[PDB]
Symmetry: C4
Amino acid sequence: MESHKHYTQSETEFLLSCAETDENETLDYEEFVKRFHEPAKDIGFNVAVLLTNLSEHMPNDTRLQTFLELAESVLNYFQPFLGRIEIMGSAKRIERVYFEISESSRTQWEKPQVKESKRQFIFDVVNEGGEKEKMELFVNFCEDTIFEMQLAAQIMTVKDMVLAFFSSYWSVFVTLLHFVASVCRGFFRIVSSLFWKKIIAYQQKLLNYFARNFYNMRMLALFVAFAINFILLFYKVSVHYVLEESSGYMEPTLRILAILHTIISFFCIIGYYCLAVPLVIFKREKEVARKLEFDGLYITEQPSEDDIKGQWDRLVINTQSFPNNYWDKFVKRKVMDKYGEFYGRDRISELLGMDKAALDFSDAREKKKPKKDSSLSAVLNSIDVKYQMWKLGVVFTDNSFLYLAWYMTMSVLGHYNNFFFAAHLLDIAMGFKTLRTILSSVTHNGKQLVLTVGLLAVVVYLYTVVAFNFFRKFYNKSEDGDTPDMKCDDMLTCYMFHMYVGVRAGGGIGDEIEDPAGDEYEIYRIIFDITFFFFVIVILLAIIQGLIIDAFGELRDQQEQVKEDMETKCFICGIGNDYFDTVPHGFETHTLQEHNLANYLFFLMYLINKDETEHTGQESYVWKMYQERCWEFFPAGDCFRKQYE
Amino acid sequence: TMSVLGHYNNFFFAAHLLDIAMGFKTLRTILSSVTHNGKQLVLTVGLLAVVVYLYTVVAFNFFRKFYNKSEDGDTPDMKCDDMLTCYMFHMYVGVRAGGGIGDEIEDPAGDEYEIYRIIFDITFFFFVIVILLAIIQGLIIDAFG
Amino acid sequence: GGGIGDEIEDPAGDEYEIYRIIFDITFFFFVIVILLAIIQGLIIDAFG
Amino acid sequence: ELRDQQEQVKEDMETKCFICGIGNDYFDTVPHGFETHTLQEHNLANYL
Ligand SMILES: [Zn+2]
Ligand SMILES: [Zn+2]
């Protein structure tokens, strides 16, 4: 403690006197910290919040500043611990509320996935987001981010050149084999031990490991697919396909690599169920619960047959574990209170479930209460079946799970035929986002491209009928002479010939057909050919190239618009850069300290996870207003600096 | 070093013409249109390689009697019988052919494969040298803007 | 239109197959792919 | 050019009023001011 030289002589002697020194000159630093740090942390945080409030609300006070200067030593400890939100409390009053931000929350906020999600949310709310629902979208994004952060926290050289290129990857193959051996043999003595406690605590750990490493094994599967497809470049025909292109050591490694790829694909499809299924289930439950509470979907506004989501979300509202992932349970009671007198007192509860359960609870509120017993190997009756089946239906409807199912199916078929592994190269497009900047230039228009090819087909069809009617003696692609075939004698044959030859010929259709020297048709067929060239492969491929090029510019313009809006406006109050740019570095300080989106998200987390009973006045106000989902507590066009001097 | 080697072989002085690019800034306005994206261009060529590889395996599995570039007749060679040979043939001929890959291979008149190989060829043309060179040209053009 | 390999003998001679393939494909990709695209891009950018 | 025309139309209709042409900034002092002005006070449908 004296080598650090943070503590002076007085402090060191004080702590040495405060030591236990219980007749052994030995102290338990664990219990010492446990008794002398946590209450100190709590009271110090409260004092820091009080001093920060006094400083921010009592400016230009030298008497307060002199105290703050000596108080700075402890005030800096809680600097990355206290948030600050500017809300609208009393009528026309921008109140600055303070709260605590947990280290776990701040750690999970800086994860790259969360940052990318926030960037995408900002992008697609600036571009196509509205104004009446900006705070709606922001609160939805905040709720999803809080749920996912909690989930994450709770967890001869033409042939030999390629041979030489792959021979350098044995150094990676051997370490992959060592990694899989440390699991199949080094972990076997633990995974095959010899009860329920020690098996559940292990299966939960394994599921958490898969959820943690879901993406890393996606990369691993991609690399294994590349290796398989590279070693597939050594095949020869003899009706029989043979891999005889090296000095052995490839025929068995291909099979073991295919087996490894299938195993990794299965582990990916089971890790997705642990990582991303809870998030989509949370979103679905939140959506259906809010529809029930604020719209009376299955009460007054029965969903139509157009949407399957509404129909499939009908057999979930009547189960007991309905809000399994919504961090609240007072939704059935809320809707019962809202529609219990306007509609059937029992007719609401019969289709919301727990009707007999409500009657039993009312009866048991009297002097009638037994003790429930728990029996091992007898939880199949305890677990819900209807809710699980609804969840399975939602999962199998989910698109991202279907992609992994198709991936697994192709991997399985790769064993039957050792070429379906080529279909796994499509994961670089349908999967990772490293090629999105290029594939977006094609998929941005999309409909325009297919409309262009349809127009091309129609124009070629018109030219085809014109050729069929007026040009007989020209479509005479005969080989060696006196063997006329592949002619214009059939209408569909001519259409196929046009679409397949004239479009790709590069020089129209006149470069693949006889010389137009026959009388009375020279100029007519010259016009025909030159117009084909100028209309089909001059201003119809130029249209496709123009669509592709314009997609790049449109995406760049969208990105520039997002950057412009986020640099010259505030996301929450939307006042403007110029007003805040009067104090040196004003706008950046306003967007980093006063109106921080991360701070607002942390405040929402604090309200949700703190409690219901000991909210302060501002916390209770904001909580009630968030529960009723109206949101004028978000500063609309005002801030603290506009409110005061 | 190149100047010194030019004395040993009087042709390494051709490597000094690269100083107009790596040196003086008179050509920066033009070379920036290529080097501004850069990573996008190599990603595009990688995607082109992957698409041509997929088409190569499809051709290897389903089109045997077509890759028959025999000269003077009865001398079959340069075929699709080898997977890497077919991939090399595709990358080296179909990409640069200007008319897809159907303009360098036999006429698809064989029964039960006419429409299938027509679809194969037209899709090669429309995906590889229509909207994949257009992507490269669009990157080059967008760099200017 | 197809580089320089479409006007010259087939690169089947030993010890030069891959080298001349690289030569031809690089000619195609550098001279008539991103060097005529530069001219077309200049023409198009002038309009804008 | 067509994309620029569409963007210009959207820009004008989002930062100006069709009738009085005052501007977005003046009305954006009351919460949701410009939208209320363009939906209730100076509605083209209302004038028709
Ligand atoms: Zn603000
Ligand atoms: Zn107006």
